[PDB]
């Protein structure tokens, strides 16, 4: 949250420690720091992107065996790092709340609980569709980069969905 300059910085797996969640955004190389005028508007677009925010959660190794995956998302996790959209699958509020030692992604707009261990599927509250899991990996220099786009649309559901 620096005032304007370099609001987004590349990230490394070591930074997230077991049982830790961090909100991450899709920062491109072209979308450099906000020093110039061309930048600071691309970065504003990233920040204001409704579906842009994601939460990266480091599953504790001891809990690793409990993880249940989603078909077509079996390799989305990079080791013990799981990227799930923050946008709730119900009405599109951010699902910011994260509970470790129970692995519950909680949405406070309507108190909806998704199981982080099992693919981020709603285990309580109004939500009925699992949070979209973002493929992740590490590129050259060991920085965490998305391994591809969401296999499904990520915001709240709508009429033209699940086809």
């Amino acid at each position: 949250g620096r005032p304007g300059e370099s609001p987004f910085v590349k990230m490394r797996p070591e930074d997230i420690d077991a049982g830790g969640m961090e909100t991450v955004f899709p920062w491109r190389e072209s979308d450099g720091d906000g020093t110039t005028v061309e930048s600071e508007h691309k970065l504003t677009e990233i920040a204001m992107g409704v579906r842009n925010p994601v939460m990266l959660i480091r599953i504790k190794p001891a809990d690793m065996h409990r993880v249940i995956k989603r078909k077509g998302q079996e390799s989305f996790n990079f080791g013990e790092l799981f990227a799930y959209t923050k946008v709730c699958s119900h009405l599109g509020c951010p699902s910011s709340l994260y509970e470790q030692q129970t692995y519950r992604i909680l949405c406070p707009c309507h108190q909806s609980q998704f199981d982080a261990l099992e693919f981020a599927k709603p285990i309580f509250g109004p939500a009925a569709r699992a949070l979209a899991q973002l493929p992740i990996t590490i590129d050259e220099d060991g920085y965490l980069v998305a391994n591809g786009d969401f296999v499904e649309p990520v915001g709240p559901a709508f009429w033209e969905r699940k086809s």
Binding site: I16, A18, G20, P94, L97, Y98
Partner: protein
């Protein structure tokens, strides 16, 4: 220190061996392992008084500390020696640094809080409800060191913000924002908690509606 570790061991052997094995490995289904938790974890957990937990429930609540500052340090040093982990910040004198943990920047601290802390606590550091019997307690009581150590070690259902996610600078910034929000008077009259819509609506329906209806009953008649 040798005497510090001795005192920490003495206190540990008769307060928490039941929850955590004598070797600090957690007793099954009673308490977790304290190896690697660090002096910061011990300081935050015991200074807040949570650790003589006295029950296994959904959420261990904060309560008056069961040990004094010196004993807190003794326990934390004992745990640090056993496993080795995060250590509570300290100033030049050696005491738990609290004033020095107030970061200068607050707007950046505010952004950090809203992105990370407000998710569950509040806009202004108040509490928040969690999945099943859990909650995020209010940040008003926690001192700067306690807030810093809470970020540095995620107690239970708290994400653990390592020194790499939130560098000491960002942690001090967040501590500064927390303290400023907690101690800042609510401009515009009595701030009804920190939650807006709920206390505000309740206060409307009590104060304003009771007053208006009572004034109507005074002005009007009954029949």
């Amino acid at each position: 220190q040798s005497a510090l570790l001795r005192t920490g061991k003495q206190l540990f052997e008769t307060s928490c061996v039941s929850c955590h094995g004598a070797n600090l490995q957690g007793v099954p289904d009673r308490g977790p392992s304290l190896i690697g938790t660090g002096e910061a974890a011990v300081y935050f957990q015991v200074s807040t008084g949570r650790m003589p937990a006295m029950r296994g429930e959904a959420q261990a609540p904060s309560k008056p500390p069961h040990f004094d500052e010196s004993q807190i340090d003794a326990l934390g040093a004992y745990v640090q020696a056993n496993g080795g982990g995060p250590t509570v910040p300290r100033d030049d004198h050696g005491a738990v640094a609290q004033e020095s943990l107030i970061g200068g920047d607050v707007a950046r601290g505010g952004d950090l809080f809203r992105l990370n802390c407000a998710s569950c606590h509040n806009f202004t550091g108040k509490g928040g409800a969690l999945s099943s019997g859990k909650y995020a307690p209010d940040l008003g009581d926690a001192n700067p060191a306690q807030i810093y150590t809470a970020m540095l070690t995620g107690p239970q259902n708290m994400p653990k913000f390592s020194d790499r996610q939130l560098t000491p600078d960002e942690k001090r910034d967040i501590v500064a924002y927390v303290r400023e929000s907690a101690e800042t008077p609510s401009y515009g009259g009595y701030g009804l908690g920190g939650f807006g819509p709920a206390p505000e609506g309740m206060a409307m329906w009590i104060i304003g509606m009771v007053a208006a209806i009572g004034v109507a009953m005074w002005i009007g008649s009954r029949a």
